[PDB]
Amino acid sequence: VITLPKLKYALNALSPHISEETLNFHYNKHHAGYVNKLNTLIKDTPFAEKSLLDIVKESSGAIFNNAAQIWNHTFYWDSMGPDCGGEPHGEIKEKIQEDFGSFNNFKEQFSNILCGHFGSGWGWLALNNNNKLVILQTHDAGNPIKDNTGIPILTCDIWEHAYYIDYRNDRASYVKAWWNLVNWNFANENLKKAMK
Amino acid sequence: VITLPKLKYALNALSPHISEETLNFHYNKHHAGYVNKLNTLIKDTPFAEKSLLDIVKESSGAIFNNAAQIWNHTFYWDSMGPDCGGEPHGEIKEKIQEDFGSFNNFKEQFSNILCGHFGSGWGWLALNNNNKLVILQTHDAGNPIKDNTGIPILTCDIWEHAYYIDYRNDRASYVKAWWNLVNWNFANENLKKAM
Numbered sequence: 001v002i003t004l005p006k007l008k009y010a011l012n013a014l015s016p017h018i019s020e021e022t023l024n025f026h027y028n029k030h031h032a033g034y035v036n037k038l039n040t041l042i043k044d045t046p047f048a049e050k051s052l053l054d055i056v057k058e059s060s061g062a063i064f065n066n067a068a069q070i071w072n073h074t075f076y077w078d079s080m081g082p083d084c085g086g087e088p089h090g091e092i093k094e095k096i097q098e099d100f101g102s103f104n105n106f107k108e109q110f111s112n113i114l115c116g117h118f119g120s121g122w123g124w125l126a127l128n129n130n131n132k133l134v135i136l137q138t139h140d141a142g143n144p145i146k147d148n149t150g151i152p153i154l155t156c157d158i159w160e161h162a163y164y165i166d167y168r169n170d171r172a173s174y175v176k177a178w179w180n181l182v183n184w185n186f187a188n189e190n191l192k193k194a195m196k
Numbered sequence: 197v198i199t200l201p202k203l204k205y206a207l208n209a210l211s212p213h214i215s216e217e218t219l220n221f222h223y224n225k226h227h228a229g230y231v232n233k234l235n236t237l238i239k240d241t242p243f244a245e246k247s248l249l250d251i252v253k254e255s256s257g258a259i260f261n262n263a264a265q266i267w268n269h270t271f272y273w274d275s276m277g278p279d280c281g282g283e284p285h286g287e288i289k290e291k292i293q294e295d296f297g298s299f300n301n302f303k304e305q306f307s308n309i310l311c312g313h314f315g316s317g318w319g320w321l322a323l324n325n326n327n328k329l330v331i332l333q334t335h336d337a338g339n340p341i342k343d344n345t346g347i348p349i350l351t352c353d354i355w356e357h358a359y360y361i362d363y364r365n366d367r368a369s370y371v372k373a374w375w376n377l378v379n380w381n382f383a384n385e386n387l388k389k390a391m
């Protein structure tokens with residue numbers, strides 16, 4: 001059976017940028033719900049004994065939706081953390097200078113994409129298939145692995161449940177606050193894997 | 197310029213099934229926001245002096261998303277009311293019995309579709325070209341007028357902002373509560389025109 005990976009931090013660790021209440025609902029209700037539902041759906045299928053990522057890559061319909069959401073949510077929690085945020089460091093800092101000119105330029109363009117997305121979905125920093133960092137947006141449970149558009153480096157959830165408790169309709173303030181939480185160590189891990 | 201149609205009732209009129217705070221944000225931020233955005237988008241375009249429905253049918257992209265959300269939201273508010281809900285009455289009760297066998301069959305089927313819908317969207321009761329009632333679901337700002345899948349009779353918003361303040365992740369409880377609000381008089385008006 002598929003399980004829900006632990007958070008690498010306490011439920012209140014992202015506060016006040018993302019509240020304990022939000023993490024509680026988003027992780028213990030939404031994310032946990034996708035795991036429970038996927039297990040239900042893949043019993044008696046060719047997917048029952050495959051990795052989550054193999055299910056993401058091979059499935060469609062409700063199985064894909066729940067599988068990709070589990071995967072996207074885990075990537076999102078790992079894309080954040082306490083005493084993170086601020087300026088990038090290490091290789092991802094260099095790669096952002098190369099591909100966007102500056103971190104501030106990347107930040108402005110990412111915020112613009114995240115705020116302009118219509119409906120539920122995800123913003124991504126990804127390494128494209130030309131070894132260049134790009135910003136992608138996906139709808140609903142979509143992600144760049146399934147789309148073959150790139151290797152995920154970081155993600156920000158912009159489904160309304162990610163922010164509605166703390167920010168209501170004001171997604172721009174959620175995005176502004178999310179920059180205090182970005183885990184550049186996870187981005188560097190992903191960059192290295194992506195470039196090998 | 198396109199304007200925001202007035203609610204037929206006060207912001208507290210649907211409580212406690214949908215809170216006054218919810219209606220405040222949903223109407224005065226989201227719905228009003230679609231109006232403001234559309235107006236900026238259609239300035240100096242051919243859409244500038246056309247009706248909302250014309251824009252809904254003929255547009256694409258961000259103009260469509262905003263136009264269709266304005267129309268969908270108005271249809272949603274008008275699909276509810278205070279001291280409404282419960283068992284259907286008049287022509288729509290008779291039509292639901294005919295097309296779904298009973299109100300409870302319809303209620304349960306519609307609830308399953310509203311609860312089952314992945315992502316942002318809408319549930320619809322519509323009339324098809326054979327004068328049969330059908331249940332439809334659309335994604336994001338989509339609606340049956342745009343799709344030619346039928347004439348709208350009632351709608352329920354299942355975007356998370358519709359319910360998150362009152363119910364958080366519990367969409368099922370929102371849907372259950374919504375049955376206490378259904379405006380069967382509006383359904384009857386719409387059925388009559390549609391037939």
Ligand SMILES: [Fe+2]
Pocket residue numbers: 026030073157159161162
């Ligand atoms: Fe989420």
Ligand SMILES: [Fe+2]
Pocket residue numbers: 222226269353355357358
């Ligand atoms: Fe809405």
